[PDB]
Structures are given as C-alpha cells and as structure tokens.
Amino acid sequence: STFLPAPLQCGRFELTFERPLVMGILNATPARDDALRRAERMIAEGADLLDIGGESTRPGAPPVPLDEELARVIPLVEALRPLNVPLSIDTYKPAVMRAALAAGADLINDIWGFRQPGAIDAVRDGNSGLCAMHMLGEPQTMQVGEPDYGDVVTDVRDFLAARAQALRDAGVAAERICVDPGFGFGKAVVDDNYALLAALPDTAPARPDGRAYPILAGMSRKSMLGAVIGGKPPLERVAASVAAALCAVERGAAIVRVHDVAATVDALSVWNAVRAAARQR
Amino acid sequence: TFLPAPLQCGRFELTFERPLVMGILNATPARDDALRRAERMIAEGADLLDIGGESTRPGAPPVPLDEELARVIPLVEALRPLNVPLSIDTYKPAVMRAALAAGADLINDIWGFRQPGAIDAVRDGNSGLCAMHMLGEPQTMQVGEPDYGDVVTDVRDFLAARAQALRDAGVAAERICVDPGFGFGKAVVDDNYALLAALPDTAPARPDGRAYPILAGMSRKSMLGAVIGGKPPLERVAASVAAALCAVERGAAIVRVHDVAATVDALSVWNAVRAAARQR
Ligand SMILES: Nc1nc2c(c(=O)[nH]1)N=C(CNc1ccc(C(=O)O)cc1)CN2
Ligand SMILES: Nc1nc2c(c(=O)[nH]1)N=C(CNc1ccc(C(=O)O)cc1)CN2
Ligand SMILES: [Cl-]
Ligand SMILES: [Cl-]
C-alpha cells in the first residue's frame, strides 16, 4: 500500500497493474461451444484474462492424455483469439505449451514452474507471459508431495527465485515472468496456506530492476476456504473466495484467478473506490 | 492488531476479539416470518439481530407509533429466549422506552439520540446504545444535502458531542458505540468512501482513551451500486461483503448486514488470515 505490482509482458498484451486484474477460470472439461459461451459471459462480467485448462491440474486428479488435452485447448485458443483478451494456458506439458503458443496463446501458467523436461525450451522464444507456480513435489512423479518447510514463505520465495533465474538463463526477459505461491499445492490446508496469504508480498522474489515479480494468486473454491467455513463444498465457497481474492489484492497481488468473475469484479470495484478515497488523504 | 473497546450491551458484555455480525431483521410486512428469519440468521452465524419496524432511511415514509410497536415488541418478546443480543432500529423515544421494558439489549438510533425524549428513555439500565451520524434536521426528520469541511472530522466531532450528551445524562461510556452513518446525508461516493477509508478516525475517544467501538452498515446501499455500474439492491451481495471486510480491516467492531452467511464466511477467511499474521 499504495503498492503497484511490476508490469507483465503477456504475449499480445503489455499488462500494467494500476488495478489488479481478474483471470477467469475456463475449465474445458465436461463441450467446446459450452466453453465459448462461458468465456463470453466471463468477459461480459469483467474478466481481464481467461485461463484455459484441458486437464484437472490439481492434486489427486486423473492425468489427461496428450491428444485429448490438445483437442480441448487448441480450438478454444483459436476461437477466443479474436476477442483480444489475454489467453492463459493452464498446462505443465511442454507439447501443449508449444502447440498453444503456436496457436497464439498469450500466457503459460505452469503448476510445475517449468520443471517438466523441455518446458523451458518450449517457452523461451517470443513474448508470452509465464507464471511459475510453487508446488511441493518431484516432477517425474507428476504427484504433489507432503508439506515440509522451515519457513514456508521463505522456501516458496527461494524456489520461485530459482525458477525465474532458470527461465532467465535460457534467455527469457524478466518482464515476461510472474510468480504464484501455489495455494493448496503441498501445503498444510490452513497453517501453510494462510501463512502465505498473510505474508503474500514476501513470497515474490525480486527482478533485476529491484521490483518484485508480480504475483498471481489462485484460491478460488479451494480447500483452505472450506476448512474455515465449517467444511462447505466447492459450490458453497463463493463469499469465502471473494474474501480471499480481496485479501490477496490488499497484500499486493497483481492477478487473482477465480471462478466467480462478476462477484470478484464487484468486490474489486468497492476495493478500488476505498483506495481512491484513501489516496485523497 | 486492533482490538475495539468492549460494549456493555444489555444482558451481554460484548468484547471484540473478533468482529461481530449484526443481522438485519426487517419486520415490515409477518410476525412469524420474522421469527424464522431470525432463527436462520442465528444458524448462519449472526451475533446480534437488529429489529426494525420502519424504514429508517433517507426519503422513507414514516410508520405510525402504534404500528411500529405492534411489529417490534412481540418480536423482542419472542426472540429474548434465544439469548442473542437484540438491537432495536428506532429513533422514536416511545419505541425505545417500550422495547427496553420488553427487554431489548441495544438501541440503534439513526438520529443519534437527538429526538426529544430519547436520552431520557435510554438513560437508565445497561442497554447498549448506537449513536449514528446523519446530516439533517431532527425536528422534521429530513435528511440534509451533503455539506462538510472534512467529513471524517465533522462525523467524529458530532459523535463526540452525542457521546458527551449521553454521558451528561448518566450513561456509562462503556454502553456507547458509534456509527458514521453510511448513506445518510453523504455524497454517494465521495463522502461514504472517505469515511470507510478513514473509518478508525471517525470514532471519538472514551474517557479511558480507547476509541468508542464502531458499528458500520453498508449492506446493499447506494454507495455500492454506484461503483458496480448501478446494479439494484439484491445484486449487491458481493459488493456488500467487500465493504464489510474493508470495515473490519479498518477496525469496525460490528458490521450490520442482510447477507449473514456470506458475511460470516468472508470474516472466517479474514480471521484465518489475521491468525496466521499473528504467528509471524
Ligand atoms: N497459476 C495457478 N494455476 C493453477 C492454480 C493456482 O492456484 N495458480 N490452481 C489450480 C487448481 N488446483 C487446485 C489446487 C488445490 C485445490 C484445493 O485445495 O481444493 C483445488 C484446486 C490449477 N491451476
Ligand atoms: N446504526 C445503523 N443503523 C442503520 C443503518 C446504518 O447504516 N447504521 N442503516 C439503515 C438503512 N438505511 C439506509 C441508508 C442508506 C441507504 C442507501 O444509501 O442506499 C439504504 C438504507 C437503518 N439503520
Ligand atoms: Cl492446517
Ligand atoms: Cl460522489
């Protein structure tokens, strides 16, 4: 406060964060026209980016075969490109990264932090945005591991610092990179996730210009929320998800990744109005 | 971490380790529909219930005394056994008198105990008292056009005078909370959002040096519609949650809301964040 996240080069777009941006989650997982209507609705509700995922990229989910992931993701990229809204791709598979970038996606959002063999090579060229997330696990297994940290905030920051360095060593400009602490990925459901949310600014390492890498935060409908509201199921977590998104932007998040776009946008309109009033004092 | 000063509140001593949620119980048509609503809001996590028999809002037509009493008193009598603080949203001294005699715990007055006879009605006993700021003329009960130097300072100075008037009549400072009165004589965005941004500065000091605890009510109000493209009241729930969270972040003791479950859930997240912060 009154913090300004560093800019993100994001394929066709140069994102700046005078206000935090809302990334609407477009799960392309049961048809195509169903997903396109969803995307149009989310844009109408105020989504600033769309995150296209052909898999369940969460802990304990079945891993989708390559041909099918390609068949879900690529035609949505092609159909949504004309809308001139950033298209993020939720994938850790280098082949999906290559095909999706060739199809004209703007951002690669990777739960494995570009650790899968060949992912860095897939993304090093061009201008796409890249979100390196923290997940505790061994990449070869494709499985999230058990929580284990000294200070989870420090460990998450150092890992993200190493991932940004690895991207930069391969020629990726620092301005194309954002980071994400990976809420719900190898974290104690309450203690680790809320430590990371309370200390969000400190999860982000510094770019060479001294500015912190901008932060993407995704908590929407997650177990960390169910755990504090008496165990209600995902569809009953909207108000809690709005609360978490607001907390993240209060703590300097550049982008919030959400299911409930209208509700998040409305909440962020109120947040911006408060900030605008505070700036006159 | 801010800890709002405690509120002596009739049968209850309220302390604010966490902010409390006051559920709005609009008792306007019946006297039984209101009761199931109250039970639901308690089940959803309401810490207080605000019983209102009128429209205590700018431009709203008034309800005659005997009708307001017919709506409020049976509800006080019916809800007392539930053992949750009962607040009465009234500016009428006769309703204040009758509600306290029926056993209400808190009097919530949009006129800041300015109506003739109000202070005299609430002097005695241990009821909590919420003195709200509204810019207007008590005699005609008309809200005024916004007019402030620094609205934050003007609101605080008014609330200091109302607290002092209550104390001059023998009211213990511990019984008093204050409310900047969002949407009552305020520029819809300029003034309301200044007050929310500078919320802790709207409360004057008690004699012990702690600020009077703050009640804030923004649920579904125009200030919210104004910033979300002019959506109507029933479509302001997400914006109302954001406002409540902002208010507690800025030290509010009680938030007054229509959407109890949604607000309680948001505050559960907020509490979890604070608890994590306190371990660092
Ligand atoms: N950059 C980025 N990408 C994602 C994220 C995320 O948080 N950040 N979350 C995702 C959803 N995965 C889940 C993880 C945990 C939970 C849960 O805790 O319930 C649910 C879903 C997938 N893709
Ligand atoms: N202590 C306290 N009591 C109240 C309050 C309130 O904000 N604080 N609001 C009330 C509802 N009045 C409205 C005022 C403004 C608006 C609006 O701006 O839309 C709507 C309703 C009545 N009772
Ligand atoms: Cl835990
Ligand atoms: Cl205005």
Author numbering:
A (entry chain B): 2 to 31, 42 to 292
B (entry chain A): 3 to 31, 42 to 292
Task: Give the text the authors published on this PDB structure.
The structure of BcDHPS complexed with 7,8-dihydropteroate was refined to 1.95 Å resolution. The crystals for the complex structure display space group P212121 and there are two molecules, labeled A and B, in the asymmetric unit. Here, the product of the enzyme reaction, 7,8-dihydropteroate is ordered, placed with the pterin directed down into the barrel with the p-ABA moiety pointing out towards the surface of the protein. The ligand possesses nine functional groups of which eight participate in direct hydrogen bonds with DHPS. Four hydrogen bond donors, N2, N3, N8 and N14 interact with functional groups on Asn120, Asp191, Asp101 and Thr68 respectively. On the other side of the pterin, O4 and N5 accept hydrogen bonds donated from Lys233 NZ. A carboxylate oxygen, on the p-ABA moiety, accepts hydrogen bonds donated from the main chain amide and side chain hydroxyl groups of Ser234. The pterin is sandwiched between a cluster of hydrophobic residues (Ile122, Met144 and Phe196) on one side and the guanidinium group of Arg268 on the other (data not shown). Modeling of loop 2, linking β2 to α2 was possible only in the case of the product complex. We were fortunate that the product complex of BcDHPS allowed us to model loop 2 and the complete structure we obtained provides an improved template suited for in silico screening.
